[PDB]
């Protein structure tokens, strides 16, 4: 409930009823770490 808007919105689905349990994936703000370095002229891509 901050960096992910959509992480809030798939949890807006999960909270109200009382089902619970978590799934994040990737934390969005840290793609700006990756991207600003990508634009710096360095290579970053999620391989493996």
Chain positions contacting other proteins, by CB under 8 A: 1-3, 8, 12, 15-18, 20-22, 24-27, 29-33, 35-44
Closer residue to other proteins, CB minimum distance, 10 or 36 = 36
Q: Compute CA distances 25 → 17, 36, 40, 41, whole Å.
A: 23, 20, 25, 26
- The distance of closest approach from Cβ of residue 5 to other proteins in the complex, given in angstroms and rounded to an integer, is 10
Residue 10 or 29 with smaller CB distance to other proteins: 29
Contacts of 20-25 with CB under 8 Å at 24 or more apart are none
């Amino acid at each position: 409930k901050s960096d992910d808007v959509n992480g809030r919105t798939k949890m807006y689905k999960n909270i109200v009823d009382g089902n619970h349990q978590m799934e994040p994936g990737m934390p969005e703000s840290f793609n700006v770490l990756l991207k600003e370095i990508r634009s710096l002229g360095i290579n970053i891509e999620l391989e493996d």
